[PDB]
Paper text:
XPB is part of the general transcription factor IIH (TFIIH), which is functionally divided into core TFIIH and the CAK complex. Analogous to the stimulation of XPD’s helicase activity by p44, the enzymatic activity of XPB is also regulated by its binding partner p52 (6). We pursued the structural characterization of p52 from the fungal model organism Chaetomium thermophilum (ctp52) using x-ray crystallography. The model shows that ctp52 is organized into four distinct domains, an N-terminal domain (NTD; aa 1–120), two middle domains (MD1; aa 121–319 and MD2; aa 350–454), and a C-terminal domain (CTD; aa 455–514), that interacts with p8 (40).
We solved two crystal structures of ctp52. The first structure encompasses amino acids 1–321 (ctp52_1–321) and was solved at a resolution of 2.8 Å. The ctp52_1–321 model comprises the NTD and MD1 domains and the ctp52_121–514 model the MD1, MD2, and CTD domains. Both crystal structures were superimposed via the MD1 domain (rmsd of 0.87 Å) thereby generating the full-length ctp52 model. Due to the overlap of both structures, we were able to generate a full structural model of ctp52 at atomic resolution. The ctp52 structure is predominantly α-helical and consists of 22 α-helices and 15 β-strands. None of the newly identified domains present in ctp52 (NTD, MD1 and MD2) displays significant structural homologies to any known protein domains.
Author numbering: 10 to 71, 79 to 165, 176 to 240, 254 to 319
Write the structure that this text describes.
């Protein structure tokens, strides 16, 4: 619904930057492309030259409903461009997806688990309370902007404001009132709610870059996919991340996708919000 809509707006140049990254290409591939599109793309990545449409039809076989829809989804997202009789895949996407399917991606590009002992008090229950309360607060905030005829971190308020889930208002003590977006946002399922905010967190950095040209969204998104491949209740090693990702842990903590302990900022714990992402 949301990620798809977001992606359908992205210009080619970004897609090819995003597909410098196996995990990304493989994540999209895995959990955007429908059962058939996968099948079509597999063969396509394997076969020698930009082959014949008719041969892809011979690949199709049964059921025979999505034969059209599958062409569109493929057409919009990847850099898998074609001209009648010829249907190519973009080097970047090919190269990226291959490495992924051959499990030959950088060793240090995944959630490196941590050797350090795990505080007995940090269980799935803790990591659920934490995350839950974190989201409670955000939801309470956007709620407390509904006319009545502390809350979250300042960085989130400003993000909701920028996102137009909330609008500045002269009348109200808060200085803030709910938008129709905000209403819609409040009705969405906890998954859709997290994506709604994350996509804003992304757009924000574009809206910034654009001006600041008087990390990029792609880096932020890649990392998100990574966090969706990690395991819940397991501690991961901070140092193994790239500077750009070490530099995103605060935002994701604010959002409740990550617990750090104060005791040891060598181990980051993804919450259920982080691992669910792509499975929803």
């Amino acid at each position: 619904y949301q990620l798809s809509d977001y992606l359908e707006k992205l210009p080619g140049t970004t897609f090819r930057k995003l597909y410098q990254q196996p995990s990304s290409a493989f994540a999209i591939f895995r959990r955007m492309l429908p059962p058939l599109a996968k099948v079509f793309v597999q063969a396509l990545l394997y076969m020698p030259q930009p082959m014949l449409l008719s041969d892809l039809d011979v690949w199709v076989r049964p059921r025979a409903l999505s034969i059209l829809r599958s062409l569109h989804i493929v057409q919009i997202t990847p850099p898998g461009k074609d001209r009648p009789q010829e249907v190519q895949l973009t080097t970047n996407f090919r190269n990226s997806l291959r490495l992924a399917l051959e499990g030959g991606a950088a060793h240090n590009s995944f959630g490196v688990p941590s050797s350090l002992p795990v505080d007995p008090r940090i269980d799935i229950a803790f990591l659920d309370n934490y995350a839950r309360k974190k989201w409670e607060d955000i939801l309470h905030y956007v709620v407390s902007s509904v006319p009545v005829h502390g809350g979250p971190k300042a960085s989130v308020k400003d993000l909701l404001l920028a996102g137009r889930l909330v609008e500045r208002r002269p009348d109200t003590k808060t200085g803030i009132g709910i938008t129709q977006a905000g209403f819609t946002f409040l009705l969405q399922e906890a998954n859709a709610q997290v994506w709604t905010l994350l996509l804003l967190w992304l757009e924000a950095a574009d809206q910034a870059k654009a001006a600041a040209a008087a990390p990029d969204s792609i880096e932020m998104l890649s990392f998100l996919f990574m966090l969706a491949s990690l395991e819940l209740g397991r501690a991961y090693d901070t140092d193994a991340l790239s500077e750009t990702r070490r530099n995103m842990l605060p935002a994701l903590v604010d959002f409740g996708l990550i617990y750090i302990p104060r005791e040891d900022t060598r181990q980051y714990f993804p919450t259920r919000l982080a691992t669910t992402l792509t499975s929803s």
